[PDB]
Design a protein around this ligand. Structure first.
Ligand code: 058
Length: 558
């Protein structure tokens, strides 16, 4: 069946669409080549539609069924709970898209009559109606990139009331199930530090390691009605409340397998027969599905001792090498099996024999040394996208601050410390907004974070070594340097100068600002101050942080 079918109507915006980076004084300080930074618009929707629209031919086999049974036996041990309206309401972002039924995210959050009554009425319709397709809105996403142009991403999502009903029935499932089914292979149970720990141990545990990253072209579109039903069958293995069991059953047929696409004008856009990106089960469902297809493809291909790390469609395999000629063949056999399971490659996979050469979750493993000269492993990535997005956030007030998430997640990196910390700490201080909370996403979930809380947050996630790292690899230094030239970002010596300036100002303020100068900017000065465990880091409530993925699940923690 076709992934999509269209009516001819256009994917429309609900407002004016900015695509060009503004010539702004503050963003210009970070990036000069403004014409190389763009945001995607609905003007590219058609190129994405051509790329995502195709017919799927799936052929499941003995290896696929064996693994599915192994996965169900593990799912059998889970006892999932049904969240109340109030608990489900509390997990709604304050700026989540309002309902088409005269209420919004703030009404949901405050548990207002119009909101609570409508959610209850949607819940009963899921218990009573097991057939009628649920309506979704199709929108082109607005994301920022650097040139060399990408076409817009298509986002599919149901109404507010429905989204609160998915939380009541599925939130605890998507939170505890993947870890019970997959174990150490579920990448969302880890922080960045724990992620390096697992990749290094897995690599070092093999006698002769071989690794590869497998890229699926338009994974959401490769997902069939069969894959979605097989997914519900893993969910049914949970101990469930009668109403939750019915809601999962109804949501699977009416929403998860396919449904009507409606544009912002209210016109009919077409029909979806694959994965909606704006649902609660997108993260969990894609992880399980990618893990099932890959695990069975390893057996079919005769690849030895497979250890895998899955985060939705992002998959990395670390196995036992059988030699060059053997490895090449087995990797093609793996691809052959994935194509049959309806997961063909975007860019063909390559056998790697050095961990640092593999890219998984846009990241790669790299080495730097601590204050005591000992080797420290950390996750990095190419800084182009994070820098182009930080420039946009400087000129325009965005709902989610990617720059803040990049600081937290990539805190030990050369680029987050020197550029991202310096740029924002200068601007915020000059505006008296260092203690003003900001929204960011960690693993799809929304968090309200004060920039001044960063030293404690980094010490917990990355240890004190995040504030002492030096002697970065030549490769890492070359990548940072060539990117700065490309985007027209000032050299590292200008950043070192700018850092010295903020550090002083932060130190004279005292309180939490002095903690920021001492820890975050100790790299910028030769007379290094004494760095000890911050009292506040000991009692940080970092639960809920690295548990599960919630991309498109409309989730708000804190
Ligand atoms: O965007 C994520 O969800 C995310 C981040 C991340 C990066 C910056 C800010 C906030 C974040 F959450 C991340 C960072 C590292 Cl070092 C490793 C994996 C990571 N993921 C999972 C992931 C799964 C699939 C594809 C990409 C990333």
């Amino acid at each position: 069946s076709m992934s999509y079918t269209w009516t001819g109507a256009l994917i429309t915006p609900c407002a004016a669409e900015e695509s060009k980076l503004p010539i702004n004084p503050l963003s210009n300080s970070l990036l000069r080549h403004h014409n190389m930074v763009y945001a995607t618009t609905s003007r590219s929707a058609s190129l994405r539609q051509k790329k995502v629209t195709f017919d799927r031919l799936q052929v499941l086999d003995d290896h696929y069924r064996d693994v599915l049974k192994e996965m169900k036996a593990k799912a059998s041990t889970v006892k999932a709970k049904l969240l109340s309206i109030e608990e489900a309401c509390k997990l709604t972002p304050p700026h989540s898209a309002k309902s088409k039924f005269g209420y919004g995210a703030k009404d949901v959050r405050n548990l207002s009559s119009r909101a609570v009554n409508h959610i209850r009425s949607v819940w009963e319709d899921l218990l009573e109606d097991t057939e009628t397709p649920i309506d979704t809105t199709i929108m082109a996403k607005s994301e920022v990139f650097c040139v060399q142009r990408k076409p817009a991403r298509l986002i599919v999502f149901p109404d507010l009331g429905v989204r609160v009903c998915e939380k009541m029935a599925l939130y605890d499932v998507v939170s505890t199930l993947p870890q019970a089914v997959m174990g150490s292979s579920y990448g969302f149970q880890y922080s960045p530090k724990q992620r390096v720990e697992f990749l290094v141990n897995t690599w070092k545990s093999k006698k002769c390691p071989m690794g590869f990253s497998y890229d699926t072209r338009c994974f959401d579109s490769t997902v069939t009605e069969s894959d979605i039903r097989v997914e519900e069958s893993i969910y049914q293995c949970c101990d469930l409340a009668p109403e939750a069991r019915q809601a999962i059953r109804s949501l699977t047929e009416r929403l998860y397998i396919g449904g009507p696409l409606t544009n912002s004008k209210g016109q009919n856009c077409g029909y979806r027969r694959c994965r909606a990106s704006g649902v609660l089960t997108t993260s969990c469902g894609n992880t399980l599905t990618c893990y099932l297809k890959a695990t069975a493809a390893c057996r079919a291909a005769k690849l030895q001792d497979c250890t895998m790390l899955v985060n939705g469609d992002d998959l990395v395999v670390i196995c036992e090498s059988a030699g060059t000629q053997e490895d090449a063949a087995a990797l093609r056999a793996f691809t052959e099996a994935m194509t049959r399971y309806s997961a063909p490659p975007g860019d063909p996979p390559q056998p790697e024999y050095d961990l640092e050469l593999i890219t998984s979750c846009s990241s790669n493993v790299s080495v730097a040394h601590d204050a005591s000269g000992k080797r420290v492993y950390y996750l990095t990535r190419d800084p182009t996208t994070p820098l182009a997005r930080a420039a946009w956030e400087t000129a325009r007030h965005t709902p989610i601050n990617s720059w803040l998430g990049n600081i937290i997640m990539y805190a030990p990196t050369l680029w987050a410390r020197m550029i991202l910390m310096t740029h924002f700490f200068s601007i915020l201080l000059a505006q008296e907004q260092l203690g003003k909370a900001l929204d960011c996403q960690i693993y799809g979930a929304c968090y309200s974070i004060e920039p001044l809380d960063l030293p404690q947050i980094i010490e917990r996630l990355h240890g004190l070594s995040a504030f002492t790292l030096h002697s970065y690899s030549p490769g890492e230094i070359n990548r940072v340097a060539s990117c700065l030239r490309k985007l027209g970002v000032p050299p590292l010596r200008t950043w070192r100068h700018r850092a010295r300036s903020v550090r002083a100002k932060l130190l004279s303020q005292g309180g939490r600002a002095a903690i920021c100068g001492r820890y975050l900017f100790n790299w910028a000065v030769r007379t290094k101050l004494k760095l000890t465990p911050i009292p506040a880091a000991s009692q940080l409530d970092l639960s809920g942080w690295f548990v599960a993925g919630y991309s498109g699940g409309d989730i708000y923690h804190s």
